[PDB]
């Protein structure tokens, strides 16, 4: 009985809950904090800890009601310190100060159902999060990188985009993104372009691929050339690697390449 709430000398989000009971010394106070600001920064370096004490058995969705959606695109919710909140004020953080102690909270919960336990809201900053293959396609292809994690948008310095780009670059091997993925010089990129160039060795991106691989990984180009020059044996450009003479196909291989000044 005689329930009241009064703001304190601190900020408006923190208040005092006052009980005036018939017993003279139950006319006491409890400092409780309820949040009313939408965060756009960090309470502590590298983390956001709104004063919303998420009680057990309650939806976690409400814990994000206190953060701007733009700012929350790259924050993940983790377990926080144990806390207690009034059932009639779901999420009113209770400060364990002075006579307020968890044992007193348990005694009050046993006496009456005006108290529940839970954990403090705790958001940590890691990176943006992807949720489907369409966002992966957007990030790796670099068509739309407004919200893309570092691992998937780092200019192909890690092999996270290898699997997508392997199939993506067979459709358009002349894409600047595909060539800059090839320039990382990993085995999937070089093998994908070896398969691409074994059929389209007479295209500009295959000239650039040959310029990229050689001399470190010439073995990924030579093989491709071989295939091309065994399929297009009538091509006038495969007449140095694959001489048109039926018996003499390796006529100008190795140092003999200089016996024909056209090669």
């Amino acid at each position: 009985n005689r329930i009241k709430i009064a703001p304190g000398i601190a900020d408006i989000r923190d208040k005092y809950m006052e009980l005036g009971f018939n017993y003279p010394e139950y006319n006491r106070a409890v400092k409780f904090a309820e949040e009313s600001y939408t965060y756009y920064y960090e309470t502590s370096p590298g983390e956001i800890k709104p004063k919303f004490c998420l009680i057990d058995g309650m939806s976690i969705d409400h814990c994000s009601s206190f953060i701007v959606p733009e700012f929350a695109k790259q924050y993940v919710l983790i377990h926080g310190e144990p806390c207690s909140s009034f059932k009639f004020r779901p999420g009113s953080l209770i400060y364990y100060q002075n006579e307020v102690t968890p044992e007193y909270i348990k005694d009050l919960k046993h006496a009456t159902d005006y108290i529940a336990s839970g954990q403090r809201c705790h958001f940590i900053k890691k990176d943006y999060l992807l949720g489907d293959s369409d966002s992966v396609a957007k990030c790796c292809s670099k068509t739309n990188t407004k919200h893309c994690p570092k691992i998937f948008n780092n200019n192909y310095k890690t092999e996270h985009c290898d699997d997508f780009m392997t199939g993506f670059c067979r459709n358009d091997p002349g894409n600047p993104n595909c060539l800059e993925w090839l320039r990382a010089k990993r085995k999937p990129a070089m093998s994908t372009y070896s398969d691409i160039c074994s059929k389209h060795m007479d295209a500009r991106y295959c000239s650039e691929f040959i310029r990229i691989i050689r001399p470190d990984y010439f073995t990924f180009g030579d093989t491709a050339l071989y295939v091309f020059c065994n399929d297009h044996k009538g091509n006038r450009n495969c007449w140095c690697a694959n001489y048109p003479k039926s018996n003499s196909g390796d006529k100008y291989l190795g140092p003999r390449v200089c016996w024909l000044h056209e090669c």
């Binding site: 929350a72 983790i78 779901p90 997508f164 070089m190």
Partner: protein, 191 residues
């Protein structure tokens, strides 16, 4: 307590990107995950977490956040040598019903092998046997030999495997150099 307790209505919660993550559509995100890297999959139930544990035996389910907010953490690469040492493009494959595929269908199990597995030296023992006889594919064997000549030896197993591969290749070519694999060995030695 005669006085009715004033009841504050909880503010309407707005979900984040993290809490709107469905593990069923994240097969293109979880698969390329590296070691000791977390991949959050949003809220998860018990049947769903069992399903995720079965579909991703190489990962561990870590309850990062309340309400079942879980993340997958890669622990090891379970890719076998015959499946992914015979090609450079394939990085991971879905195995199910006793068959291997590169396309995801329900009930499959992910199997990923190490990045640049050839550079580590695990594929040498397999491709040495696979590149002799009728099972000789010119592209894969030639590219394997060429990348074995230009190999960045990082771990001790790398040097050990490279030395064993050179010794075995030298012995086999001393036996006979007319076979295609010894022809490629001689060509890359010349190069």
């Amino acid at each position: 307590v005669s006085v009715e307790l004033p009841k504050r209505d909880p503010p309407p919660g707005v979900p984040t990107d993290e809490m709107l993550l469905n593990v069923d559509k994240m097969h293109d995100v979880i698969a390329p995950a590296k070691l000791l890297e977390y991949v959050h999959i949003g809220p998860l139930a018990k049947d769903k977490e069992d399903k995720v544990k079965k579909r991703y035996p190489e990962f561990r389910l870590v309850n990062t956040g309340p309400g079942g907010l879980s993340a997958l953490l890669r622990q090891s690469y379970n890719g076998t040598a015959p499946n992914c040492c015979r090609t450079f493009n394939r990085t991971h494959y879905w195995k199910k019903d006793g068959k291997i595929s590169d396309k995801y269908e329900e009930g499959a199990v992910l199997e990923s092998c190490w990045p640049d597995v050839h550079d580590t030296g695990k594929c040498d023992v397999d491709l040495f046997d696979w590149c002799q006889g009728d099972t000789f594919d010119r592209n894969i064997c030639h590219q394997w030999i060429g990348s074995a000549f230009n190999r960045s030896n990082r771990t001790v197993e790398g040097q050990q495997s490279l030395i064993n591969l050179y010794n075995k290749m030298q012995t086999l070519c001393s036996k006979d150099a007319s076979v295609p694999i010894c022809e490629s060995f001689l060509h890359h030695l010349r190069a």
